[PDB]
Design an enzyme around this catalytic site. Sequence first.
Site, PDB file in Angstrom:
ATOM      1  N   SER B  11     -27.916   1.706 -29.813  1.00  0.00           N
ATOM      2  CA  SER B  11     -28.330   0.271 -29.509  1.00  0.00           C
ATOM      3  C   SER B  11     -29.229   0.230 -28.331  1.00  0.00           C
ATOM      4  O   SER B  11     -29.004   0.562 -27.117  1.00  0.00           O
ATOM      5  CB  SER B  11     -27.115  -0.604 -29.417  1.00  0.00           C
ATOM      6  OG  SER B  11     -27.681  -1.965 -29.268  1.00  0.00           O
TER       7      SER B  11
HETATM    8  N1  GSH Z   1     -30.640  -9.353 -26.890  1.00  0.00           N
HETATM    9  C1  GSH Z   1     -29.168  -9.209 -26.893  1.00  0.00           C
HETATM   10  C2  GSH Z   1     -29.106  -8.564 -28.446  1.00  0.00           C
HETATM   11  C3  GSH Z   1     -27.423  -8.378 -28.647  1.00  0.00           C
HETATM   12  C4  GSH Z   1     -27.375  -7.876 -30.121  1.00  0.00           C
HETATM   13  O1  GSH Z   1     -27.846  -8.380 -31.217  1.00  0.00           O
HETATM   14  N2  GSH Z   1     -26.832  -6.504 -30.348  1.00  0.00           N
HETATM   15  C5  GSH Z   1     -26.437  -6.111 -31.698  1.00  0.00           C
HETATM   16  C6  GSH Z   1     -26.467  -4.456 -31.649  1.00  0.00           C
HETATM   17  S1  GSH Z   1     -28.209  -4.121 -31.455  1.00  0.00           S
HETATM   18  C7  GSH Z   1     -25.004  -6.542 -31.866  1.00  0.00           C
HETATM   19  O2  GSH Z   1     -24.262  -6.709 -31.164  1.00  0.00           O
HETATM   20  N3  GSH Z   1     -25.074  -6.506 -33.346  1.00  0.00           N
HETATM   21  C8  GSH Z   1     -23.585  -7.114 -34.081  1.00  0.00           C
HETATM   22  C9  GSH Z   1     -23.318  -8.284 -34.224  1.00  0.00           C
HETATM   23  O3  GSH Z   1     -24.366  -9.308 -33.872  1.00  0.00           O
HETATM   24  O4  GSH Z   1     -22.650  -8.807 -34.861  1.00  0.00           O
HETATM   25  C10 GSH Z   1     -28.796  -8.258 -25.698  1.00  0.00           C
HETATM   26  O5  GSH Z   1     -29.659  -7.911 -24.749  1.00  0.00           O
HETATM   27  O6  GSH Z   1     -27.548  -8.145 -25.429  1.00  0.00           O
END
Ligand code: GSH
Lengths: 220, 221
Positions: B11
């Site tokens: 990630s």
């Molecule tokens: N822009 C946010 C992105 C957070 C994000 O979308 N993370 C993803 C991983 S790439 C996630 O947790 N996905 C699982 C979900 O949203 O349920 C940051 O910098 O923390």
Amino acid sequence: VKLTLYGLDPSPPVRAVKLTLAALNLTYEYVNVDIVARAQLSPEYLEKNPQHTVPTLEDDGHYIWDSHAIIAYLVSKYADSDALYPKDPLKRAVVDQRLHFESGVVFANGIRSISKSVLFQGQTKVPKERYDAIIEIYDFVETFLKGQDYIAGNQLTIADFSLVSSVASLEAFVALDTTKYPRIGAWIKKLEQLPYYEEANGKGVRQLVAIFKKTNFTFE
Amino acid sequence: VKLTLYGLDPSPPVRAVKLTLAALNLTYEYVNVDIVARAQLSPEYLEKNPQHTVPTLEDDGHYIWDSHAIIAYLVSKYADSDALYPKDPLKRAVVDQRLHFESGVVFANGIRSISKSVLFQGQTKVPKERYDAIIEIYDFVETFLKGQDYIAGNQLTIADFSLVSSVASLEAFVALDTTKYPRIGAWIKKLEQLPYYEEANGKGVRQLVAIFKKTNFTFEA
Ligand SMILES: N[C@@H](CCC(=O)N[C@@H](CS)C(=O)NCC(=O)O)C(=O)O
Ligand SMILES: N[C@@H](CCC(=O)N[C@@H](CS)C(=O)NCC(=O)O)C(=O)O
């Protein structure tokens, strides 16, 4: 004479800055940039903002862009206290999170996603994940408001300005079931009580909802 | 001892935090959150982070989320100086602009647009628009690097860490043409010189490139 703000009243991020300016009692000049006309693409604007976005702020010859960066700058430079952007690390971390959430999940993914299809490529029907994106925005923001009067804690912050600026514009794409989302409804109404809300944010919300209502655009 | 970081290596925003932790020489526990298995949607994690994103950081019983809020918190609280996140308002305004740029323009619109489709909803071809967003990202960052070695002035900052974790991962989708984009090419190389880069970002960049390779997914023209 010192501060000049570039943008136009339908833009949510422009309205985040208008609110913050009003909130800090800062005199400023307002220069329209017609995005529809593609005025932002000119090399004179480009000079001010390589990214060719609105809002841009000019202070005393320095150009600052991105509504979140602008309003953080304004508080940290011109507020009497840190009430609108507290310097306490934990409090600051909540505010910073809500700002960054606005930039990504709310603005780029919920609003600009739709805005480019309809307003800039004539597209007339929109994919349902565009719809679902908004619903998820409402659900998150409903959850974020649990136990508190403002979006990042117990005091008004630039995070309230940034998120009300766009969340209220979401009405343009999907109306707000205020019985499904009584916290988003109360929050908007509490901010609408601010003496400067109507000029800074209220009118541009309604303008944006009518710009979209006219496209007759549909989901799925 | 004190800090725990929840995330996984592929990630991009987790790796922005890993880079920062390493640059501050902070010790931390690293807890895997398996988003393929949807572990972020457990009661446990939802209580820690209602938005159920990785990364999340735990410090002294407090939960901070969003990579950009986390890395600003870490510098502001643990660094010997503000070098990584300068307090001068003008200098701050550039770093903050780049960071919000990363959140919206790069991550939400460039990466998670595709990733959500390709990996969670198993879609095998994605729209031309997703390709162009990524070209637009590269053009922007190329212009942002004009006349300086780092993304936000001429000192290493958390903007470098945030944007490199994401901009380097874009190879997964569109390979970087260093004739068009020599500044980015060179900015990545300069960040690769950091002794901590390989563990904090380099490996996970390669795992993500590999995960996308395996999907064989295609852009529409
Ligand atoms: N822009 C946010 C992105 C957070 C994000 O979308 N993370 C993803 C991983 S790439 C996630 O947790 N996905 C699982 C979900 O949203 O349920 C940051 O910098 O923390
Ligand atoms: N998240 C940025 C968004 C800026 C943005 O995309 N603004 C639009 C107006 S809604 C714009 O200037 N579009 C014209 C363009 O990008 O060329 C901010 O908060 O300033």
